[PDB]
Design a binder for these strands. Structure first.
Ligand SMILES: [Mg+2]
Ligand SMILES: [Mg+2]
Ligand SMILES: [Mg+2]
Ligand SMILES: [Mg+2]
Ligand SMILES: [Zn+2]
Lengths: 84, 66, 184, 122
RNA sequence: GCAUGCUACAAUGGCUGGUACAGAGAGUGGCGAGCCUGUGAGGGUGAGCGAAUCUCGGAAAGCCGGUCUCAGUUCGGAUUG
RNA sequence: GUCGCCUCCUAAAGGGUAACGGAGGCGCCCAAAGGUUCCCUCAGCCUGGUUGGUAAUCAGGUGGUGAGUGUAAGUGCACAA
């Protein structure tokens, strides 16, 4: 994982969008392609549409999400099983 | 009680290795009882564990970042 | 030997006074007390051999201190693979001094050394002031040996008390002292 | 029932009888011995109760062991399941979670090979 | 499902302390010694060397002492927290 | 297909009563499943309980015959047969 002394990586536009949402009301879905970013407490209770390759799947970030990346909650491959 | 069908059952000292000695009765053949832990010694209700859980998911975040 | 047990003395003095004060029975012989202790074990994997019953008899005899009643199968069942009249379980009834001292031994010694012991549920009463529970493993009764038991077995422990209602039965067994959690 | 919830096997050196405990490994057992000041090269059947309980106290005070650690690990896996991470989804699927390849073997997670009939050539 | 490999299933071995003997190569956004710090990966300082010079560097198997004693193990190191 | 024996119905409230009328059994079994004496009450249902499940064994509550009776059926049998 990322070095501790480098701090968490939030993609610096997701951060600004969630801060603006905090300032103007925590009610909107924030569309982003930043699977790369780190969930932080400052965005807790938001809903973020994380890109998964072809669609911005929405995730409602809760308290326990914080120690995870945004892309962990937007699966990229679909399997459904072999045969049927 | 019926004679000859019941086990040996006589006076029996128990020591709990925690400062507790008692004078119960059991079938401990030619011997007594050397317990490992007592009721008033067990960490269950004497209150010496208090595990509950570690549910601070965010608390971990500011622990390693704050 | 002639000596009225510690648990019996504690019951009489402390528990009878406590029940008389915090249930307000209008008659002196209405305070509940332990009537009997029943130690059962169904060893149903005895339909194919007898050695398991012999081991169960030895274990329960050592644990309690008296010969057990061995119950034969009331009816045969194919899917349990037991015939009619086969011995499939054994139980012991304890009253009086044996009851009191076995209860004292159990509470003070045995269930303390249950693996990762967390206490006993308070919601295992039959609904009439009697409380029955189960032990999944047997050698935890340190009154028995350790390196000669044929196989691990379990048992059921039932406290039958002269308690009319579940709440007063729970109060009696709490005052006698059980590990009672706050969980279902 | 020698230690917390496990019986140390007789005629085996203490330094590995300690590792026989869940939650205790080689280095954890070595630390435990150095803290308790107990030799590690003596068999378990020569163990006085005082030093045995001193070792038990040190282990219980410092280390999550046996049922506690097992419940903690199960709780962690269940938390991954209920949060729905990629690792949690792999856990529910019973499939490797740490980015292992799954095309060829992945066998220790996929179990035994349940071979299936396929298309037949001419 | 196949194919090429690696690590194994242990005692001609595992673990542990000590101690020998190479060759061929690479290096300036590089090779980095030494010292300090950390259980360690590493971090902080940081000489030297465009290199038969300085660094990578320790060779490992082996030998010697101790230990494990045939145990699905003090074998194996997959998986998982 | 049937032929002797047993139980029920037909059989019309004693007994008896036919049909190639309607249902089933028997050609045994048990040294106890006989004699006697004393003791006991079931099935089902509800609740609680290691393995254990609808149902093994245990506890409490309920429950009068719906269980049971070596073997068909009827008449009996819980005063227990
Ligand atoms: Mg060069
Ligand atoms: Mg007539
Ligand atoms: Mg007539
Ligand atoms: Mg005629
Ligand atoms: Zn104690």
């Amino acid at each position: 994982p990322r070095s501790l002394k480098k701090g968490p990586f939030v993609d610096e536009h997701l951060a600004k969008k969630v801060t603006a949402q905090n300032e103007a009301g925590t009610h909107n879905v924030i569309k982003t392609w930043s699977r790369r970013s780190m969930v932080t407490p400052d965005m807790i209770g938001h809903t973020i549409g994380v890109h998964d390759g072809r669609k911005h799947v929405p995730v409602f970030v809760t308290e326990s999400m914080v120690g995870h990346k945004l892309g962990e909650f937007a699966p990229t491959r679909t399997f459904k099983g072999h045969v049927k | 009680m019926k004679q000859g069908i019941h086990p040996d059952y006589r006076e029996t000292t128990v020591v709990c290795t925690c400062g507790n000695t008692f004078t119960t009765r059991s079938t401990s053949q030619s011997g007594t009882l050397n317990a490992d832990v007592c009721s008033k010694c067990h960490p269950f209700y004497t209150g010496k564990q208090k595990i509950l859980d570690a549910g601070g998911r965010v608390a971990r975040f500011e622990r390693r970042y704050g | 030997a002639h000596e009225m047990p510690r648990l019996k003395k504690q019951y009489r003095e402390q528990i009878r006074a406590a029940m008389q004060e915090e249930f307000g029975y209008r008659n002196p012989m209405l305070i509940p007390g332990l009537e009997k202790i029943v130690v059962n074990m169904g060893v149903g994997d005895a339909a194919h051999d007898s050695k398991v019953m012999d081991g169960a008899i030895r274990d329960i005899t050592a644990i309690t201190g008296q010969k057990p009643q061995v119950t034969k199968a009331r009816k045969s069942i194919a899917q349990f693979k037991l015939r009619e009249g086969q011995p499939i379980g054994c139980h012991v009834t304890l009253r009086g001094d044996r009851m009191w001292e076995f209860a004292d031994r159990l509470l003070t010694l045995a269930l303390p050394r249950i693996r990762d012991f967390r206490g006993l549920n308070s919601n295992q009463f039959d609904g009439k002031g009697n409380y029955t529970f189960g032990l999944s493993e047997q050698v935890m009764f340190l009154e028995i040996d350790q390196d000669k038991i044929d196989r691990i077995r379990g048992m059921d422990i039932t406290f039958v008390t002269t308690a009319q209602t579940n709440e007063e039965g729970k109060a009696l067994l709490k005052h006698l002292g059980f590990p009672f959690k706050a969980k279902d | 029932a020698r230690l917390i919830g496990v019986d140390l096997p007789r005629d085996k050196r203490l330094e590995v009888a300690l590792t026989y405990i869940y939650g205790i490994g080689r280095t954890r057992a070595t630390e435990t011995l150095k803290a308790t000041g107990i030799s590690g090269d003596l068999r378990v059947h020569e163990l006085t109760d005082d030093q045995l309980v001193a070792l038990r106290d040190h282990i219980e005070a410092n280390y999550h062991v046996e049922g506690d650690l097992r419940r903690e690990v199960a709780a962690d896996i269940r938390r991954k399941i209920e949060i729905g991470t990629y690792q949690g989804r792999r856990h529910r699927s019973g499939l490797p979670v740490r980015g292992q390849r799954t095309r060829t073997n992945a066998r220790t997670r996929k179990g035994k090979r349940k071979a299936v009939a396929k298309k037949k050539a001419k």
